[PDB]
């Protein structure tokens, strides 16, 4: 029974790692990262 | 365009009272500059008003 | 500030600067020069600003990776205590075998 | 050369309607500028036409 507790409560750690990485994947680019993209690209249009 | 200046100016990790106050002051400066201008002349694109 | 400074210098440049028998001397291009300086400055300031933003997003991503590491360490710590509980049983059963 | 301007302008991670619209507008500006030019003079490289 104690070995079972060891297994399932290590599984809770694996679940926290899996869902945290999925939360990092689905929102790969946030509102700040693309703001830099738009700001950097706006500088390219001043050559003409 | 000045609200787009505002958003990218205020978008950062650390926000403090002084930073947002200064950003609002710059935005208000832009708004005041674009509001004080006066019209000189105009043209009407169509034959009929 | 640089835009106002360059526009002020441009406006102050169109007035003539030689007088008497020779006149003129006003550089006709000064407004286009000021518009060029301010419009090339704009690109540099937008690059600086975008680099500040990218630094901010970097520090945030790093902090999230410290959540991944801290949670992994906490889970390993938590599983060790139950391992100790199991060994405590195994030892009680070994005293009983004695 | 303007299609090479176009490709590297549109190549990025995030593509939106406004970004591609503006890129097309810049490309069309380049095309219009290179299309309105007029010939002045010419030379024929060979003795015979």
Distance of CA C12 to the CA centre of its chain: 38
Q: Is B14 on the interface with A (CB under 8 A)?
A: no
Q: Which residues of A touch D19 (CB under 8 A)?
A: 38, 41
- Count of beta carbons in the 10 Å neighbourhood of residue A9: 14
Report the alpha-carbon distance of residue C65 to residue C71 in Å, rounded: 10
Whether residues D22 and A34 touch (CB distance < 8 A) is answered with no
Contact A20, C72 (CB under 8 A): no
CB within 8 A of C7, min separation 6: which ones?
C34, C38
Q: How far apart are CA B29 and CA C3, in angstroms?
A: 14
Total Cβ atoms within 10 A of residue D23? 20
Please choose, from the candidates A31, A41, A25, the residue with its C-alpha nearest in 3D space to the C-alpha of residue B12. Answer: A31
Q: Indicate the DSSP class of residue A27.
A: T
* Residue C32 contacts residue A14 (beta carbons within 8 Å): no
What are D8's two structure tokens? 């590297």
Task: Report yes or no: A20 at the B interface, CB cutoff 8 Å.
Answer: no
Take residue C47 and report the two structure tokens written for it: 């690059």
Distances in whole angstroms, Cα of residue B8 to Cα of each of A17, B2, D11, D12 = 32, 10, 22, 19
- Give B30's contacts (C-beta < 8 A, 6+ positions apart): B2, B5
Alpha carbon distance A4, D49 (integer Å): 94
Give the list of residues 6+ apart from residue D49 with CB closer than 8 angstroms, or none. Answer: none
The sign of the torsion formed by the CA atoms of C23, C28, C31, C36 equals negative
CA distance linking residue C28 with residue C19, whole number of Å? 17
* H, E, C per residue of D1-49: CHHHHHHHHHCCCCCCHHHHHHHHHHHHHHHHHHHCCCCCCCCCCCCCC
Question: B17: exposed, middle or buried (C-beta count within 10 Å: 0-12, 13-18, 19+)?
Answer: exposed
Helix, strand, coil shares of chain B, percent, nearest 5, are 55, 0, 45
Are the beta carbons of A20 and C43 separated by less than 8 Å? no
Query: How far apart are the C-alpha atoms of B29 and A47, rounded to whole Å?
Result: 27
Q: Cα–Cα distances in Å, from C97 out to C87, C91, C93?
A: 15, 10, 6
Experimental method: cryo-EM
Round to whole Å and give the CA distance between C79 and A14: 12
C82 vs A2: CB contact, 8 Å cut-off? yes
D3 vs D14: CA distance, rounded Å: 20
Whether the Cβ atoms of residue D14 and residue A37 lie closer than 8 Å to each other = yes
């507790």: which residue's tokens? A5
Name the residue of chain C whose CA is nearest to A24's CA: C64
Which long-range contacts link D26-32 to residues 24+ away (Cβ below 8 Å)?
D26/A45, D26/A48, D27/D2, D27/D3, D29/A48, D30/D2, D30/D5, D31/D2
> In terms of DSSP H, where are the helices of chain A?
2-26, 33-44
């Amino acid at each position: 029974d104690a070995e079972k507790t060891v297994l399932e409560k290590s599984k809770a750690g694996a679940q926290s790692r899996f869902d945290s990485y999925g939360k990092l994947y689905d929102e790969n680019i946030n509102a700040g990262e693309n703001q830099a993209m738009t700001l950097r690209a706006s500088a390219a249009g001043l050559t003409t | 365009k000045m609200m787009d200046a505002l958003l990218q100016s205020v978008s950062q990790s650390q926000l403090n009272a002084d930073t947002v106050e200064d950003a609002f002051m710059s935005y208000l400066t832009s708004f005041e500059q674009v509001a004080n201008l006066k019209v000189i002349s105009a043209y009407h694109d169509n034959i009929n008003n | 500030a640089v835009q106002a400074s360059r526009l002020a210098g441009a406006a102050a440049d169109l007035v003539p600067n030689i007088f008497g028998f020779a006149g003129g001397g006003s550089r006709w291009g000064a407004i286009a020069e000021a518009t060029g300086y301010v419009m090339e400055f704009s690109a540099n300031v937008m690059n600086t600003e975008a680099d500040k933003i990218s630094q901010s997003e970097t520090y945030r991503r790093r902090r999230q990776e410290w959540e991944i590491q801290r949670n992994n360490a906490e889970a390993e710590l938590k599983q060790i205590d139950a391992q100790l509980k199991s060994l405590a049983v195994r030892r009680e059963a070994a005293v009983l075998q004695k």
